[PDB]
Amino acid sequence: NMLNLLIHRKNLNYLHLDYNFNLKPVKTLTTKERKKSRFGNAFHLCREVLRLTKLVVDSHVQYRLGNVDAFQLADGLQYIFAHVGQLTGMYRYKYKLMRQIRMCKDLKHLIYYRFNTGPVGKGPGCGFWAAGWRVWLFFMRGITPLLERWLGNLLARQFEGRHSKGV
Amino acid sequence: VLKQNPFWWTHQRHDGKLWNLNNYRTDMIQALGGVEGILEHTLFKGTYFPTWEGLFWEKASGFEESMKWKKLTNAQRSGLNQIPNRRFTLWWSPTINRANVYVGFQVQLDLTGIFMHGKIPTLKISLIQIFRAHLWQKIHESIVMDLCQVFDQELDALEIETVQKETIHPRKSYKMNSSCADILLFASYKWNVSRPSLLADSKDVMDSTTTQKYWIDIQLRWGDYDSHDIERYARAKFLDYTTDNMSIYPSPTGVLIAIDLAYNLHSAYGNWFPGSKPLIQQAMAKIMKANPALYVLRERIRKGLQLYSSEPTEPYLSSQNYGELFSNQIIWFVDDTNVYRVTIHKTFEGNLTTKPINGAIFIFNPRTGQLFLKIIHTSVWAGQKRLGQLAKWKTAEEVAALIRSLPVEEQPKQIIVTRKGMLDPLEVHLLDFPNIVIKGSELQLPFQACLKVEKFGDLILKATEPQMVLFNLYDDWLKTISSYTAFSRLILILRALHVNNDRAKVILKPDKTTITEPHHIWPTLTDEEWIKVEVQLKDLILADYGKKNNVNVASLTQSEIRDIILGME
Amino acid sequence: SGVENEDQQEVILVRTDQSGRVWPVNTKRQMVSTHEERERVRYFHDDDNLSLNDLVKNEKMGTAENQNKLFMRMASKFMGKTDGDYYTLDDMFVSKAAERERLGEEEENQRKKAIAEHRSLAAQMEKCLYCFDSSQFPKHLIVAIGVKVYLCLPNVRSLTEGHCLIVPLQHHRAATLLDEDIWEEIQMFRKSLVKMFEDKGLDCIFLETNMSMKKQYHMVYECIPLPKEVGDMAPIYFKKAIMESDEEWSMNKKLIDLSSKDIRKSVPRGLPYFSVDFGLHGGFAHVIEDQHKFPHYFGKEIIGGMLDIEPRLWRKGIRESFEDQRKKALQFAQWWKPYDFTKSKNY
RNA sequence: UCCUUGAUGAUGUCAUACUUAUCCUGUCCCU
Numbered sequence A: 001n002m003l004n005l006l007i008h009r010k011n012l013n014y015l016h017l018d019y020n021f022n023l024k025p026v027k028t029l030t031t032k033e034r035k036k037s038r039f040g041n042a043f044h045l046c047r048e049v050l051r052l053t054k055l056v057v058d059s060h061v062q063y064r065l066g067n068v069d070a071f072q073l074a075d076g077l078q079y080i081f082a083h084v085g086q087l088t089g090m091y092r093y094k095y096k097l098m099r100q101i102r103m104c105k106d107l108k109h110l111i112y113y114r115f116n117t118g119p120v121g122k123g124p125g126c127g128f129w130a131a132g133w134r135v136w137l138f139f140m141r142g143i144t145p146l147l148e149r150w151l152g153n154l155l156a157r158q159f160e161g162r163h164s165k166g167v
Numbered sequence B: 001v002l003k004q005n006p007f008w009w010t011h012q013r014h015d016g017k018l019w020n021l022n023n024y025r026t027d028m029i030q031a032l033g034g035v036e037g038i039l040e041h042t043l044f045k046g047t048y049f050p051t052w053e054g055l056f057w058e059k060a061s062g063f064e065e066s067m068k069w070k071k072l073t074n075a076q077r078s079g080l081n082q083i084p085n086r087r088f089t090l091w092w093s094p095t096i097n098r099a100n101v102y103v104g105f106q107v108q109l110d111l112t113g114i115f116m117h118g119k120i121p122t123l124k125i126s127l128i129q130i131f132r133a134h135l136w137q138k139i140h141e142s143i144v145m146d147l148c149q150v151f152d153q154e155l156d157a158l159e160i161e162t163v164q165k166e167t168i169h170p171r172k173s174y175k176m177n178s179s180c181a182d183i184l185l186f187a188s189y190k191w192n193v194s195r196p197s198l199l200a201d202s203k204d205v206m207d208s209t210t211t212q213k214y215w216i217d218i219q220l221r222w223g224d225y226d227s228h229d230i231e232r233y234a235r236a237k238f239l240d241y242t243t244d245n246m247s248i249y250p251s252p253t254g255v256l257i258a259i260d261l262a263y264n265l266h267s268a269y270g271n272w273f274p275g276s277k278p279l280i281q282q283a284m285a286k287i288m289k290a291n292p293a294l295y296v297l298r299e300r301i302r303k304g305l306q307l308y309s310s311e312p313t314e315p316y317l318s319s320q321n322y323g324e325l326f327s328n329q330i331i332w333f334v335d336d337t338n339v340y341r342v343t344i345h346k347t348f349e350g351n352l353t354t355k356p357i358n359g360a361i362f363i364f365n366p367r368t369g370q371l372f373l374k375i376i377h378t379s380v381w382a383g384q385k386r387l388g389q390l391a392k393w394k395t396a397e398e399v400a401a402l403i404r405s406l407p408v409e410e411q412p413k414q415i416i417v418t419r420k421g422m423l424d425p426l427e428v429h430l431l432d433f434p435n436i437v438i439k440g441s442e443l444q445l446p447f448q449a450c451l452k453v454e455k456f457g458d459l460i461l462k463a464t465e466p467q468m469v470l471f472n473l474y475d476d477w478l479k480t481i482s483s484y485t486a487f488s489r490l491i492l493i494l495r496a497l498h499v500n501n502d503r504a505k506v507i508l509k510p511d512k513t514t515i516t517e518p519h520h521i522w523p524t525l526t527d528e529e530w531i532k533v534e535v536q537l538k539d540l541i542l543a544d545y546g547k548k549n550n551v552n553v554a555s556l557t558q559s560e561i562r563d564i565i566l567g568m569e
Numbered sequence C: 001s002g003v004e005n006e007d008q009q010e011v012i013l014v015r016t017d018q019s020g021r022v023w024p025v026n027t028k029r030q031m032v033s034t035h036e037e038r039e040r041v042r043y044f045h046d047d048d049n050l051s052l053n054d055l056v057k058n059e060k061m062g063t064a065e066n067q068n069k070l071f072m073r074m075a076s077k078f079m080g081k082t083d084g085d086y087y088t089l090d091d092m093f094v095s096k097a098a099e100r101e102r103l104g105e106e107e108e109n110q111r112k113k114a115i116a117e118h119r120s121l122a123a124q125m126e127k128c129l130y131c132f133d134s135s136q137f138p139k140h141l142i143v144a145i146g147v148k149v150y151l152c153l154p155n156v157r158s159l160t161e162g163h164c165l166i167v168p169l170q171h172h173r174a175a176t177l178l179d180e181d182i183w184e185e186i187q188m189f190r191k192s193l194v195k196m197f198e199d200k201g202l203d204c205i206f207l208e209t210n211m212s213m214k215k216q217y218h219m220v221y222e223c224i225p226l227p228k229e230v231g232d233m234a235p236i237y238f239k240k241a242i243m244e245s246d247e248e249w250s251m252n253k254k255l256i257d258l259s260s261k262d263i264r265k266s267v268p269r270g271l272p273y274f275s276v277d278f279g280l281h282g283g284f285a286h287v288i289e290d291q292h293k294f295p296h297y298f299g300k301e302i303i304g305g306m307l308d309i310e311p312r313l314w315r316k317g318i319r320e321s322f323e324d325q326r327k328k329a330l331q332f333a334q335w336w337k338p339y340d341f342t343k344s345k346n347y
Numbered sequence D: 001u002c003c004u005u006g007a008u009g010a011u012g013u014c015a016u017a018c019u020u021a022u023c024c025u026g027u028c029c030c031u
């Protein structure tokens, strides 16, 4: 609701934010409409963070609906945290996240080799999402002030206005 | 000179080349994997060339030409600086666009089953141009229709009632998540099917009989280097699509067929009912080499790659085929050699000028002996008469209109052409008749010489109105000999007419009491007399070939003599 | 089809492609609607007019460009700037799918292409030395006449003694563009000229230089006799000089061998190919890219260097007396009396 | 019961010559 109230206050009726936080144009845009509707790293960071959380919460919703499993929930969460850079696309709008992404890959190499040891083969079957969970919460610990400042200046420019030659 | 050279210390006019790197190139190929291992990183399979040998690249017709020499304003080369790189980026596209090379969000491409990892600069334009005008949907519904029409002709060999094509929403071809049903079968009593297996498996029929219901699905993927194993893909999509709730099938006892557009691989995984796996094998093998939509795919890929090939073509009639001329099919020879014929004369200024003469289209049956002579009058050449080239198109148009007027019983199965330039117009003008195979001949025939006969020439030169005239060049031969004996006799006669054209007439008419009939072309002889004149015309062919090539005919082997007389070595 | 009455006449409007096939030619942007309810359903303006058989037809008739027509339009001025990411040349190409200006596509194709091709061809025909009914056409350098090809002699000082040419009647621009009936008759003149120069103690080198195939140059098949003590050293010169021709780090692997493959099934229909054949044995061929690092002569220069001739012969020629010195045709015609195969009226 | 100033066949029609939303990339002629 927040992201498309930001869309509808900017009168960008030709954009559409779907329910999985993919922003697509409804029609084919002119040059003026395309320059008007270019967003920045604040909007797309908030949109991709909300994509990651909706992936997590929907995994839990399909567990709570009776659709999936306990074990398949654990392995789905372990995939989500091992593959944020492949499921979301947060890296495009802040690149330093590769530091986190590679780290999760390293943990996936550390855990699986200890997990797939004996009779257990190379199937999916491994939900040990504590490590990737810690890595993506420690990311959020530092991305909270950066995004609060960026979204604050975004809202302040939308509601106060831009100061042309003020600074 | 403002340019700096690194070869400042030598010159090849004086010192020579001083380095040679062909051993380097040779074991560079052998180190990368060989040509076979290199070309699996490429779209070579998507071009569907049989071999790689005579492939020539063609940077002479790209955008870097007459325009882009003097475009000027070098800020042009700021957005359009990646346009020389497009062809390259197309060619190695199964390795640029991998999962394991770009860790990325991996969006789907527009109306395709193509996924683009990352934001490769010119790849998306190339993929839009190759799948221009809804080619995924047309490829999918052309394969569904082909497999249905395969099932529309094998009813009373299997247990059937009626195959039925679902008209589902069109937006299922480019949907990797789930599918619906590409055809539904309707068996008479029951099918004890087998179990799920592959398309290239051997045996083992078994479990439950599942009356009236049988589905196939058709999945078109766009493989990359990492994932183009079509069998593992087919079984994975089967086990995912049959055991989920988003995709619900009529029966649990059907097959899906996976086709990789990038590599031209195909396979299947499902419940095979008896006498269907060796049917679908032959069917899919036929469809992967005759489908007109895959043809547009392949030609658009080659088109975008600008990559050509002399040495392979469609497989000709060249030498070893020719026994297949005399099967139970309707085969035509078409010859347009004498269509646009010209005679040159001098004017009062002295300068030589060109006036046309009436031509003909030579259609011959090599399995009955029936002839179609289409006399092409001068009054269709009112409109160019300086260069020609519309000869090919008027010939193809008249052959197409003749097959159009001809009943469906005598329609050809193969049309075998003497001049290869006709292979492309007929292929256009016979799109109304898809079952006609058009095949070229390396084996050149003397069918131009048939109009050297006085009856044909006096018919053509004195005409003033286009007419279709019928003949039989096997005059009464089929009462005693076979079609191929009569055909080899006719090739001997026409070749001897092409070589000397008068000594053949003297030898075939040595006596006034030897006669010929007005219903027929050649004199009436008993079979011993035919053996005599066949040996004589064989001598006329061989002696003049040896004279034109400074060789003796008493040393030539039987295969060499056959190649001299019948075709060309 | 199209008519276009060129100053009195009638010409059937046709287009040639790369492969030399000749097809009959039948006869503010509004940003159409390249979506639906929220979903994209077509890219260009005519993705629902074309059927599958129509795509097969337009793939066969369609010339081998399809990138160039779009890149010409989106290369021009007043058209923004690719700002790195978020607006590349990819989505610029998606945005340029306008609604072409009421058969303006067929108009530009027909008018540009048909008229341009005809205009160029007419000019070439008018000033062609060959194609009998032309303007220049010496007409006394004719020695032979065949069914479809003829011998000629060059209009200039003629590099060697029995220098001759094998020219077809019509413009055909290549040997790979020839039909088999013309090609088998060029091979008969070739096998007769070899037998004429072999009994005279000479040797034969048959050149075929085919430059860029869109300026419509007439086909001419060289024949340059040089003495046998120099023609046994002739594949060495051409083998050295083909590989020290064209743009280094080329693609197509220079010096195609033609020992038993005889360019008809060696070089694809469409792309330039210099070729040289030594007598009756086929020699070499070189697919030409980069039309500036390869001279339009190239063969008379190698032959003219191994015979130590001045460069005014091979480039630009030296003219002769317009009837008097050009009666080497008289000398050539008494050479080509025993080896004439084009007549039988010699009673 | 007002009110303000002039530059030597013309005028019209038809024909000929000179520049494109539009693009292609270069050769003649005599001793």
Ligand SMILES: O=P(O)(O)O[C@H]1[C@H](OP(=O)(O)O)[C@@H](OP(=O)(O)O)[C@H](OP(=O)(O)O)[C@@H](OP(=O)(O)O)[C@H]1OP(=O)(O)O
Residues within 6 Å of the ligand: A079, A082, A105, A108, A109, A112, A116, A121, A122, A123, A124
């Ligand atoms: O293809 P491999 O080199 O053998 O590696 C794969 C890959 O892991 P890496 O990313 O570390 O290479 C898979 O993940 P992705 O390919 O999807 O990134 C992973 O499975 P997940 O997808 O579940 O991570 C899989 O693990 P496994 O084979 O145990 O299922 C693992 O193979 P290895 O485990 O043999 O390294």
Ligand SMILES: [Mg+2]
Residues within 6 Å of the ligand: C081
């Ligand atoms: Mg700018």
Ligand SMILES: [Zn+2]
Residues within 6 Å of the ligand: C125, C128, C129, C130, C131, C132, C170, C171, C218
């Ligand atoms: Zn000409």
